[PDB]
Amino acid sequence: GSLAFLPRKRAARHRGRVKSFPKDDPKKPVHLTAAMGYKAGMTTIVRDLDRPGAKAHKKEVVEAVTIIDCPPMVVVGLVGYIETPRG
Amino acid sequence: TGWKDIPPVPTAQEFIDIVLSRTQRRLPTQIRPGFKISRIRAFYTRKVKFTQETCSEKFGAIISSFPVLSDQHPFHRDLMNILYDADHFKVALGQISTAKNLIETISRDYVRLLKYAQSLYQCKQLKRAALGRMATLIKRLKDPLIYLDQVRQHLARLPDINPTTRTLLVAGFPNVGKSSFVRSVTRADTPVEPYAFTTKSLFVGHLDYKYLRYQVIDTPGILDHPLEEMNTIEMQSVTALAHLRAAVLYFMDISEQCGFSLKAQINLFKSIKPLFANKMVFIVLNKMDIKKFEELDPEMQQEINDLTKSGEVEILRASCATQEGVQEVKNHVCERLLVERVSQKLKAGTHSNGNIGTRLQEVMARIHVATPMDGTTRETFIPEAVKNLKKYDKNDPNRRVLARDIEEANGGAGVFNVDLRKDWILENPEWKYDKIPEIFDGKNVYDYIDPDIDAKLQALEEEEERLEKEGFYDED
């Protein structure tokens, strides 16, 4: 197997840590970076492909798609981080 | 097809350097005195065998790749002989074989010596001695490699003609205008510089004549020498004229501007006449614009007509400077060549027996034209629009839009997305760019499309009203 994913470790937390966020520049307008939901399941869709240069262009394409139930999330806190020579 | 796919050959020092580089780099290189004597001898004999193998494969590639002189068409063999002395080429390509064979002999010799070697220093000096023998052999082979490299380079940069195909040779004295004629008739670049031997090699162009390919060859030229003594350039010229089964055109000029007397051209042509007796030959009076065919002296006219007397010769006029008659002369000569080729093709298959060849049966099947016995012609639908629209021309500025130009403006092959909605034709225009329902309540809207469905629904509603009057839903 791949050496970047071994030894096989259990996930310390059932939730899942984000680790890395997109890099910040002041110029864009304000926006959140993340959201959460719950994997409900998957269904099948058929789509009019709009990929120029593809063999199946402008044709019915059948794909499998995951459904994530996403109730509205509630803001309950703010946190302020400071940049330090130790991170 | 040619001879350009001939691998380059190195010099002596080069070949030594690369061969020793392979035997150094491609095999294990470390051995120790503490190792077993059997493994030591195996190591050193593997070195010797690899050196043998690389030398043998390289020399084998070289020999088997150079051309085999006396299996080619006589044009080719004599052309490569005049360019490159055949006996000397052959003694070279000889030395190289004998040298390779001696390499394999030394290989077995030192293989037995290493097999019976008894010490590491023994194997040391044995391998050193063997590799020294091959090094000295190539060192003596230094000069053949240079000669063969030069012949390889030219044989690569050699024009490739087809002796069998329809060919037209242009010959004569130098400066007559052969190169000018060939540039006029075909798209081949030939130096037209005005000095005696401008072209030192045969030049080749191609033309089309009612959808048929012809190859035109320009030869350098021939002087008054009686073919016993010649320059090599004149020798390749005469070899082409003698071994290229083709139409022959001899370009001569009434003006002695070429530097040779009309009598000199007459003597040269009668000398080369037996070489052209079998063929069809065409003397072309060039530079008629500066010196026409009338004004020269009557006995000169008489001698050129006496030359004309024979039945396989023809006379034509041309002026390559203004291109007065190049089209006409090429058309006429190639037409007669085509007629002769047709005659030969008919004879091949019309040979005496009474049974025609399968290819000839096929050619009659192809040439046969079918026509209805009734002789009636069906009426045709050609519209006046395509009758009077304009022809499609790429350089024309005031151009149509073109889907290609729309594509290039809006991206490329994988960028532009074509829209069929603009091509849709509909009664109400804003109908376009509208979604079309397909499935509804699990039944196909398309499958249930039908005109007069309003009247059919009215009929169904009348039927349901009759049923309701019948009480077709009451509970008892």
């Binding site: 063999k55 199946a56 044709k59 394409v61 059948v62 | -």
Partner: protein, 135 residues
């Protein structure tokens, strides 16, 4: 160019090396013996498998005496192994069939018996030309 089709989507290849498939064209062969699949990758212990629209080396084990025990390229036309199609449709054929083809694309035969896969017909134009049934 090496004899590998260009512009082919993924499918469930169902014809391994060494497979006895039946013949499709009127060349005279009764069956073709898949012995080598052109374009297959280099993986150890993995038997090269071919699908519809792939030229595969074939050998006539049973056929007319003129054409018997002859090796020439051939392209897969029908496969009984189920494969899916981009419209989400899983389909398979009754048999395993291929038509003898030269490496440029000229088929030795003249008529193709039975139906022809859309993949083979699209990847090779003359298969569509000389194929009387393509579905």
């Amino acid at each position: 160019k090496r004899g590998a089709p260009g512009g082919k989507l993924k499918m469930t290849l169902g014809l391994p090396v060494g497979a006895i498939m039946n013949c499709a064209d009127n060349s005279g062969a009764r069956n073709l013996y898949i012995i080598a699949v052109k374009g297959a990758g280099a993986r150890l212990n993995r038997l090269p498998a071919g699908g519809v629209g792939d030229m595969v080396m074939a050998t006539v084990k049973k056929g007319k005496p003129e054409l018997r025990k002859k090796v020439h390229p051939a392209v897969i036309v029908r496969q009984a192994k189920p494969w899916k199609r981009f419209d989400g449709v899983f389909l398979y054929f009754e048999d395993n069939a291929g038509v003898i083809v030269n490496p440029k694309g000229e088929m030795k035969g003249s008529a193709i018996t039975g139906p022809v896969g859309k993949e083979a017909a699209e990847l090779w134009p003359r298969i569509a030309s000389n194929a009387g049934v393509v579905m």
